[PDB]
Write a protein that binds this DNA or RNA. Structure first.
Lengths: 334, 53
DNA sequence: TATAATGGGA
C-alpha cells in the first residue's frame, strides 16, 4: 500500500502557523529578489544562480567544475553583496518547507478527481507540481491565505494532467471538456427515461450547435480502445486478437501478385526501345516514386515536351499491341 | 519591518532592543560561534573541527 | 492567476 506510505510521510511534516506561513512566503520573495540583484552584481543568468543555490542546499553531489566555480565566485564578493547570497540560500530553504507543509492540501484536493484514468498517486504528483508553481509566484503582500492560491493551482495542474495523459490516444483539451459535458447529460436522462438515449434526444439536450450526427461522432472518439488481450469465452486459451485478421500485412497471394506484376511489366517494357521504356518509367513514377511531368523528362533527354509526348504515346500503343497478343497483363486489373 | 511603511517600527532614539513575547521557542542542540568582520562559510554546508568559520 | 480550503477508501 504505497498510499499509506506517502500519507504517513507527509504526516510527519506538521502544518505551519499563519505566522510561519507569512515568514516562509516572505523569505521566498526576499530570496527571489536577492537572486535578481546577484544577476546585476555578478552578471550571469537568474536560473544559473537558482540551480547553484538549489544544489548547495538540498544535496552535496559539471559538479566539481562549473557548480563549484560559480559558487566560488559568489563566495568571493564584498560583504554588502554577500548578504544576498545568504538571503537566497535561506529563501530557497523557505520554498522547501513551504511546499512540504502543504503537501497535505494536495491530497485533500486530488482525491476528488479519482476514477478518470489516472491513479491516486498520479493525481497527487501532478497536483504537487501545481503546489510548486503556486509557491514560486505567490505574493503574501495581498494578505490572502496560501490555501486559496494553491487550490487554484492544484486544480489547474490536475485538470491539465487528465487532459494530457488519461487517454491512450491523445485528445485535445477542449474535446475532453466537451466529452465530459456529453457524458454528464446521458446519465441524468437515463434516470429520467429509465433507458439510454438515442443520438437525437441527447443532441436536443446538449443545446444549440449540437445535432444527432455530432453527438455520435464525438462519442465515437470518447470511447477508449479495446484490449487485444480481452479473453474470449471461459476457456483460457484465446484472446480477442487471436481472432482478428491482419488487414495490413499482405497475404502470400498478394505478395506474389505484386512481384509477378513487376516482373511481367519489365518483360513488357523490354519490347520497347530503352528511351521509350525510360520515358514511361519516368512518367509513371517507376524510377523514384513520383510522376515526372513532360518538362522534367524532356530535360532528362534534352528534347521538348511534345517530343516526349510522342515517345510516350508510341510506347503505349506498342504495349497495347503486345498485350493484345500475350494477354499477360490483362488480369492484375481488379 | 512591516507590510506597509506606516506600521514599520522606527527607533525614535538611540537605545537597546530586547525581545520578549515569543510564539514558540526552538531549542536546537548546537553550539554558537559569534563573528565579527565577514564570513566565507555560507548557509547550509557541513564542517569539520578546525575548519575556518 | 487570489474568500478559504491541509492524511484514502474499499
Amino acid at each position: 500500500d504505497p498510499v499509506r506510505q506517502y500519507l504517513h510521510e507527509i504526516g510527519q511534516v506538521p502544518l505551519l502557523t499563519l505566522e510561519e506561513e507569512i515568514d516562509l512566503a516572505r523569505k521566498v520573495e526576499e530570496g527571489m529578489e536577492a537572486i535578481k540583484k546577484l544577476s546585476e552584481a555578478t552578471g550571469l543568468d537568474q536560473e544559473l544562480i537558482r540551480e547553484v543555490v538549489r544544489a548547495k542546499i538540498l544535496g552535496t553531489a559539471p559538479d566539481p567544475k562549473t557548480v563549484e566555480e560559480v559558487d566560488g565566485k559568489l563566495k568571493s564578493l564584498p560583504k554588502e553583496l554577500k548578504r544576498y547570497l545568504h538571503i537566497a540560500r535561506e529563501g530557497e530553504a523557505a520554498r522547501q518547507h513551504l511546499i512540504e507543509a502543504n503537501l497535505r492540501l494536495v491530497v485533500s484536493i486530488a482525491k476528488k478527481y479519482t476514477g478518470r484514468g489516472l491513479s491516486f498517486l498520479d493525481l497527487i504528483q501532478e497536483g504537487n507540481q501545481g503546489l510548486i508553481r503556486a509557491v514560486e509566484k505567490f505574493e503574501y503582500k495581498r494578505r490572502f491565505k496560501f490555501s486559496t492560491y494553491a487550490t487554484w493551482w492544484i486544480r489547474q495542474a490536475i485538470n491539465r494532467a487528465i487532459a494530457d495523459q488519461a487517454r491512450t490516444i491523445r485528445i485535445p483539451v477542449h474535446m475532453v471538456e466537451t466529452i465530459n459535458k456529453l457524458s454528464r447529460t446521458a446519465r441524468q436522462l437515463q434516470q429520467e427515461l429509465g433507458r439510454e438515449p438515442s443520438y437525437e434526444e441527447i443532441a436536443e439536450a446538449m443545446g444549440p450547435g449540437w445535432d444527432a450526427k455530432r453527438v455520435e461522432e464525438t462519442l465515437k472518439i470518447a470511447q477508449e480502445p479495446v484490449s487485444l488481450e480481452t479473453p474470449i469465452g471461459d476457456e483460457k486459451d484465446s484472446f480477442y486478437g487471436d481472432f482478428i485478421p491482419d488487414e495490413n500485412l499482405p497475404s502470400p497471394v498478394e505478395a506474389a501478385a505484386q512481384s509477378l506484376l513487376s516482373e511481367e511489366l519489365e518483360k513488357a517494357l523490354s519490347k520497347l526501345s530503352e528511351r521509350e521504356a525510360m520515358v514511361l518509367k519516368l512518367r509513371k513514377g517507376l524510377i523514384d516514386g513520383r510522376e515526372h511531368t513532360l518538362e522534367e523528362v524532356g530535360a532528362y533527354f534534352g528534347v521538348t515536351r511534345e517530343r516526349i509526348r510522342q515517345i510516350e504515346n508510341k510506347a503505349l500503343r506498342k504495349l497495347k499491341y503486345h498485350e493484345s497478343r500475350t494477354r499477360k497483363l490483362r488480369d492484375f486489373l481488379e | 519591518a512591516a507590510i506597509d511603511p506606516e506600521e514599520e517600527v522606527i527607533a525614535e532614539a538611540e537605545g537597546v532592543v530586547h525581545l520578549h513575547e515569543p510564539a514558540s521557542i526552538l531549542v536546537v542542540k548546537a553550539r554558537v560561534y559569534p563573528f565579527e568582520d565577514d564570513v566565507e562559510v555560507t548557509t547550509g554546508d557541513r564542517v569539520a573541527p578546525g575548519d575556518v568559520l
